[PDB]
Design a protein around this ligand. Structure first.
Ligand SMILES: [Cl-]
Ligand SMILES: [Co+2]
Length: 162
């Protein structure tokens, strides 16, 4: 398993614009378009990202290209952030993916903000980290997903994804 397979399972794939659980417009594999209430605006963002008049509808290839770009950006965000990079560097290949998963979902900034969990991961205090991560609005609003990611951190296996 790898990060792409993982996030595809976590985000799913929608080829039409949709309101997500928070009411934000989104498309493809977890690609946020806009946090704004206007479908118009989302439509506009979408055509700008794709480069054509989509009418809120895209192809699988188009979605996968967005995803690739999004995964790329999550990694760059990690390597760029002073707080995240040392942690990422200290982890193994499986746990690095759980970290990217979080950065993909919430942004470099959002993740850099989990100060205590970050420190625990760095120290390889897996169980503590897991407990700390679950005490969050993240977990409460995305329980099953969050549980998979935390489990992955905890065990350093892909078991939660089978
Ligand atoms: Cl884009
Ligand atoms: Co969410």
């Amino acid at each position: 398993m790898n990060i792409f397979e993982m996030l595809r399972i976590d985000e799913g794939l929608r080829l039409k614009i949709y309101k997500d659980h928070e009411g934000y417009y989104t498309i493809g594999i977890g690609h946020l378009l806009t946090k704004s209430p206007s479908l118009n605006a989302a439509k506009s963002e979408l055509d700008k990202a794709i480069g054509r008049n989509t009418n809120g509808v895209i192809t699988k290839d188009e979605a996968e290209k967005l995803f690739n770009q999004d995964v790329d950006a999550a990694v760059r965000g990690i390597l760029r952030n002073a707080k995240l990079k040392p942690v990422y560097d200290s982890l193994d290949a499986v746990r690095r993916a759980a970290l990217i998963n979080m950065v993909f979902q919430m942004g470099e900034t959002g993740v850099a903000g989990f100060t205590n969990s970050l420190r625990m991961l760095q120290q390889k205090r897996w169980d503590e980290a897991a407990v700390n991560l679950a005490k969050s609005r993240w977990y409460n609003h995305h329980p099953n997903r969050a549980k998979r990611v935390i489990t992955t951190f905890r065990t350093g296996t892909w078991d939660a994804y089978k």
